[PDB]
């Protein structure tokens, strides 16, 4: 098998500051500072849960991919999960061979990623990232 | 970063996904993605059947309604194709946690016995950024 550990769960939030402060000051999580990533059109806050991370996303730019998501879910909502694969290239070829959204691109962690359409995943947008 | 950290929040225990078909969802993660998938476990006391997808560092729970009064039944009526439902974070002691939330004037959605036999509570997604968060005793 090529599948690995869950890298992160992504949450689109309508306010980055108040979302990060909730997990930090209400739930007592270890929370990072807001990191702007213009090449991906989001600002990210990393919530470290020990075994995995939570990514709080906020749009950065008008053509941001998650800008439309927050327009349908104005209060926020779960966006996608990220599972690691030992090799992104053999994975896509095994998925293409298995006749299974994204046309391989460098992800928000500097590693190549792809996104699977939620229809084939049970309703959840699944991002596969090179381990 | 080896900083001073005093907190009762723990590891992420699972991420829950409500699916319109348990069998076809479990088969996808097992046979398409190569994940370790459990057999369907019925939980009538909670009105769901659950399939556990073990990713090593955490688990994903694929939920399907079991009974007409299922709690995720309304979710699957709005999201017919499925969707992410909630996350579950462990706490070192559920009782000290709930009152620390009450002291912080945080109104909770739910203490009840959860799907793993341990006491749980649910926070309203408005205060969590849109995600339903379940706290369960570690
Ligand atoms: Co991501
Ligand atoms: Co749960």
From Swiss-Prot, chain B:
Keywords (alphabetical) are: Acetylation, Cobalt, Isomerase, Metal-binding, Mitochondrion, Transit peptide
Keyword set includes Transit peptide = yes
Provide the GO biological process annotations: L-methylmalonyl-CoA metabolic process; short-chain fatty acid catabolic process
**What compartments host this protein?**
Mitochondrion
EC number annotated for this UniProt entry: 5.1.99.1
Q: Which residues carry this modification: N6-succinyllysine?
A: 78, 112
The VOC domain covers 11-138
Query: Could you list the residue ranges that cross the membrane?
Result: none
N6-acetyllysine is found on 112
Per the record, the domain of life is Eukaryota
Q: Which residues bind Co(2+)?
A: 14, 86, 134
What main location does UniProt list? mitochondrion
A single MF term (Gene Ontology): methylmalonyl-CoA epimerase activity
GO cellular component terms, semicolon-separated: mitochondrial matrix; mitochondrion
Described purpose of this protein according to its UniProt entry: Methylmalonyl-CoA epimerase involved in propionyl-CoA metabolism.
User: Which pathological condition is tied to this protein?
Assistant: Methylmalonyl-CoA epimerase deficiency: Autosomal recessive inborn error of amino acid metabolism, involving valine, threonine, isoleucine and methionine. This organic aciduria may present in the neonatal period with life-threatening metabolic acidosis, hyperammonemia, feeding difficulties, pancytopenia and coma.
Say which family it is in.
Answer: Belongs to the methylmalonyl-CoA epimerase family.
**Name used for this protein in its record:** Methylmalonyl-CoA epimerase, mitochondrial
Taxonomic source organism: Homo sapiens
């Amino acid at each position: 098998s090529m599948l690995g550990r869950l890298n992160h769960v992504a949450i689109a939030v309508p306010d980055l500051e108040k979302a990060a402060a909730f997990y930090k000051n209400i739930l007592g999580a270890q929370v990072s500072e807001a990191v702007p990533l213009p090449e991906h059109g989001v600002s990210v806050v990393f919530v470290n849960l020990g075994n995995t991370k939570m990514e709080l996303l906020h749009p950065l730019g008008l053509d941001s991919p998650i800008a439309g998501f927050l327009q349908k879910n104005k209060a926020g909502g779960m966006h996608h999960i990220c599972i690691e694969v030992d090799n992104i290239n053999a994975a896509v070829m095994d998925l293409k061979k298995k006749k299974i959204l994204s046309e391989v691109k460098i992800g928000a962690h500097g590693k190549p990623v792809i996104f699977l359409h939620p229809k084939d995943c049970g309703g959840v947008l699944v991002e596969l990232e090179q381990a």
